[PDB]
Every structure is written in structure tokens, then in C-alpha cells.
């Protein structure tokens, strides 16, 4: 126990505390802290955990563990790219571990992977400590930009992207404006007609108010399809994460029935793609109202 | 009276917080902030805790493991009940094993066709504390169709008439403790015997992220026993280890049972279950699907 998010009661325990999920915390046994640093944007920790392999933490929040990252990486990537024909040019906002790069690379149709990550410290420790995730960076198709995805999207050419994937941290910290309407509007402008967005869109158990405004906002902006998907990620709070899938008006996009089917994938397949749009009654009624 | 020292259960990792520990999920714990510890008791089977959480309402704990929070209980009780009951026509006779919180009882009651709900819970203390501290519970013990027995469900199944149940739901605690043999081949054989032809069992069958060795053993055993359908489904439960849990669905030799396409549609309205997510619960991640249908 060295970092302030580590136990005052016993050595070698990390607990994920945050006002974003009050009264609850996922606690993980720590074999060793591998890195602590303060970047320009974030407090950054990597630790070797007993049972989840290596762990990336940003401002006290678990961004990734080796044991379960296939769930988030595969779903956030293949939900959008398997939903459209022949994707060629794709933009990753955040994605500092390079996991999304690794999944995007699986698509042979892809010619260009642009990535805009605000925090070089995250890139640094990701290539050093998680090479099986950060292998993403090695694909000759990748262009890596260190910068705020807000500004990058503003300077993107209108109608230039087949897909945008917003692999962002939580609304507390530098990803704050990535959750807000003007950022969604710049995504829309930068997408071809029938082009798609896939965002990190929180917990239906923990964040329904937030998700309800994101969806209302996306319905004002994207006149194609607007859909919400969820997945299991044990080491995210509540055990689940969700995604906004949105298309700009034009060629029809059916996110629930992928027409572009893709080591072997460890999580994603064509059936769980459609199953992730099958929300629980309490959520479904909100999401589609 | 003094007795044998029992370790601290509360504030083991964060002062004011319960952390859920077990060798069934090594090197991790779900932690919940504690407002008030309502009950601590030792029965003839288990350590029994009830506490008021800060953000998950009341929480039942058995042998240090969370069994239920008020906030997320709708996911397990709706799925483990309607996945089986919505897969067979006009169920009349249903057996619940364990289920001492009475949640399953409640979701079983939503079914008009049902005429008797047999229940066998080994631990009278869990019944008593669930009725005391939890709001829907004592009422959803009062449905005239409920026949509650205190006993080991292994014994109850050996007592049952051959082919006498349309459906059995095993709402059990983990293999460590009194539920051990509900996971084992002989109890499964005895469920298949108690079921009619085309009859259905739904079992609490752990986490695909945590328990794949265990799950492959249950599935392989079920395939040997139940010559109908054998299918594994999963759902989201935040306060269960890894935040998912699963269910073995099996039907015996008889009228075909399609657990994936439920022929039967269905505590106020359902909060969680719906026809679409019935189907979605059988769509497993690739690493699980290989092991489970191989
Ligand atoms: C690490 S990734 C989440 C883990 C699951 N792939 C989220 C990244 O978002 C970055 N981030 C946050 N805000 C921004 C903005 N505004 N722009 C770019 N990148 C951002 C942050 O530095 C993380 O590395
Ligand atoms: C509380 S319930 C699970 C929580 C979500 N409904 C699980 C119950 O199984 C009982 N249980 C455990 N072992 C057995 C046996 N062997 N027989 C019957 N009931 C059992 C145990 O006492 C709990 O009340
Ligand atoms: N808790 C958040 C951290 C980033 C990815 C998942 C959401
Ligand atoms: N860990 C288990 C305890 C209660 C039953 C389902 C999950």
C-alpha cells in the first residue's frame, strides 16, 4: 500500500472509489505497484494485481486489466465496424492503451487509423507495461496524435470518416466535454453520411440520468440510427459498460444486425453483437422513450 | 459465555465498508459502504448477516458472501424464474430449492398457470431474517400456493414422486457451505427423475469469468443426464462476483423445449426480464461458447 487509493487497513489492496459510483468499490489484491506519476492531465498508476494481471488506473479509476480487457476492446471496436460495409478511415479518441488500435487493425478493409489521445504519459506506460494491448501502435496504418480530441474533431474535414470510436475516461477529468452535445455535433460533421460513432457511454445501473441526456442529445444530432449497447466488464464499476452507436442520415445502418462480420477474438461474435442491444426492461424503457 | 474467536467481517479493507472475500474469487472483493448492521446470527448451517448499505439498500450475507441487495435483486430473481417458466407451456407444479429470501417465490407467483409452489430451504434463519428486514418477502410467502419445507434440498429431491414437477429452480448459495452437493451429479440425476418428460431445471451456475472449470463440469454432467435441451444463460448482477451470474437450463426426454425462443410470454411490472433479453442471455462470449457447446 503506497498510493492514497490503497487500503489504510491492510497492505496490498487497491479500491476503486469515486463520487461517480457512491457507496461502492471494486477492491483488487496488488502484488506490486509498477508506476506512479502525475502527467499534465491525470494521476497515473500501473500495478501488477494478484489475479487480474496488470492494471492501468487514471485518477483513481480502473481503465484496464489484462484479464478482462478483451470484453471492452472487442465490443467498442467491432460493434461499429461490423455494422458498416468496407470501413477504410477510422478515428479513435482517447484509446491511450492502444487496445482499440489492435482491434481496428483486425479489419483488412481499413487503410487509415487516426488516433487522438490527450495524455502522452498514458501512451508511455501502455507501451512499456502492456505490450499485448499496445501492439496496436505498431500497425503501419496508425497515425498517432497527442492532443485534445475536442480540437482534433473541430479541425477534421467534413464527411471524411467512416467511423469514430470515443474510447474515453469518465466525465470527471479531461474527457468531460467528450460527453457533451457540441462534441457529438463535431463527430456528426466529421462522419460521411451513413458513417458511425461508438462512444464509451457508462453504466445503465449507475448513470441512467447521464445516459438519458447523451441519448436525447444523440437523437437531436444523428438522424440515422441511435442505439445503446451494453457489455460485461467485471473490472468496471457495476460489472457493465455501455456504448452509444449512432449513424448520420444516409445509407441505412442496422447496428443490431451486423452486415460486415469480422489470435482468435476472445469475447465478440456475431450473436453477442445483436444480444448487446437487448437491454433490461428498466433501461430499454428509458433508452428508447 | 465465551466461544471460539471469529474474525472481523466489517471494515476489513475500508473502515465503514463490507468487503466480500472468498477463495471462489481470489485477489478481489466487492466493497459496499455500511450504514448499519441490522443482524448477525449463527444458525445450524451458516453465518447470517443483514446490513443497510449506503447506496444498495439492505443486503443479505451468508458465510461472508452477498446473497441479495435491494437495488439489483430484480436481475437474478426475474431471469432465474422466467428463463425456465417462460420456456414451457402452462406450468402448474414448481419446486424451488433454497431461495430463502423469497424473491424467487415472488417471480414464480406472477405465473397464473402455477397451482403449487413447493420450496425447500435448509436454513430457517434466512427465512426469518428475510421476512423481518426485507419489504416484499413476508407477503410473497403468503401467496396461498407456497408450500415451504425446512430441509436439505438433496433429501427433498430423493422424497419427490417420479415425473411430478414441470420445473425445478435451484436458487442455491455457493458450492462452499450447505449448497455443495446441489452442484454434484447425484442431485442433478435426482432432479431429472423428479421432473416430468419435457420438464425443466434452472440452476444458479456461477460466473463464466471466474468459474469456467466448475461450469464445464456441471455442463458435462447435465449433458450425460438430461437428453432434452441443455443451455447456459447469463445476466448482469452488479453485487455478484465479477458482476455476472449464470444458469444451467436443462429439459428431460419429452416434448422439445426451446429455451432460446420462449413460447410463454409474461412486485409491480418486471424491472429486468423481457422476451428480447430472454434470448440475449444465451449469447455467450466466444471464450465461454467454445467450452460450453464442445
Ligand atoms: C485509457 S482509455 C480507457 C480504457 C479502456 N480502453 C481512455 C483515454 O481517454 C483519454 N482522454 C481523456 N480525455 C481525452 C480528450 N479530451 N482527448 C483525448 N483523449 C482523452 C485518457 O487520457 C485515457 O488515456
Ligand atoms: C439466499 S438464496 C440466493 C440469493 C438470491 N436469491 C440461496 C439459498 O440456498 C439455501 N441452501 C443452501 N444449501 C442448501 C441445501 N442443501 N438445501 C436447500 N437450500 C440450501 C441457503 O440457505 C440460501 O437461503
Ligand atoms: N469507468 C470508466 C473508465 C474507462 C472505461 C470504462 C468506463
Ligand atoms: N456468489 C453467489 C452467491 C449467491 C448466489 C449467486 C452468486
Residue numbers in the entry:
A (entry chain A): 35 to 296, 305 to 331
B (entry chain B): 31 to 296, 304 to 331
Quoted from the paper:
Longer polyamines are produced by aminopropyltransferases (APTs), enzymes that catalyze the transfer of an aminopropyl group from decarboxylated S-adenosylmethionine (dc-SAM), a universal cofactor of APTs, to a polyamine substrate. Thus, spermidine synthase (SPDS) utilizes PUT as the substrate for spermidine (SPD) biosynthesis. AtSPDS1 and AtSPDS2 share the fold of polyamine biosynthesis proteins with the characteristic two-domain topology. The active site of AtSPDS is formed between the N-terminal and C-terminal domains.
The third determined structure is the crystal complex of AtSPDS1 with two bound compounds, dc-SAM and CHA, which precisely shows the binding mode of the cofactor and the inhibitor of SPDS. The adenosine moiety of the dc-SAM is stacked between Leu212/216 and Ile152/156 and it forms three hydrogen bonds with the surrounding residues. Two of these H-bonds are created by the N6 amine with the carbonyl oxygen atom of Pro208/212 and the OD1 oxygen atom of Asp182/186. The third hydrogen bond is created between the N1 of dc-SAM and the backbone amide of Gly183/187. The niche is formed by polar residues, Asp131/135, Asp201/205, and Gln107/111 that create three hydrogen bonds with terminal amine of the cofactor’s aminopropyl moiety. The key residues in this part of the active site are easily recognized in the structure of AtSPDS1-CHA, where the polyamine groove is occupied by the inhibitor. CHA is bound close to two perpendicularly situated Tyr residues, Tyr106/110 and Tyr270/274, and its amine group crates three hydrogen bonds with acidic residues at the bottom of the polyamine grove. These are the direct hydrogen bond with Asp208, and the two water-mediated H-bonds with Glu236/240 and Glu50/54. The AtSPDS1-CHA structure gave insights into the inhibition of the plant SPDSs by CHA. This competitive inhibitor binds inside the polyamine groove of the active site creating three hydrogen bonds at the bottom of the pocket, analogical to these created by the bound substrate.
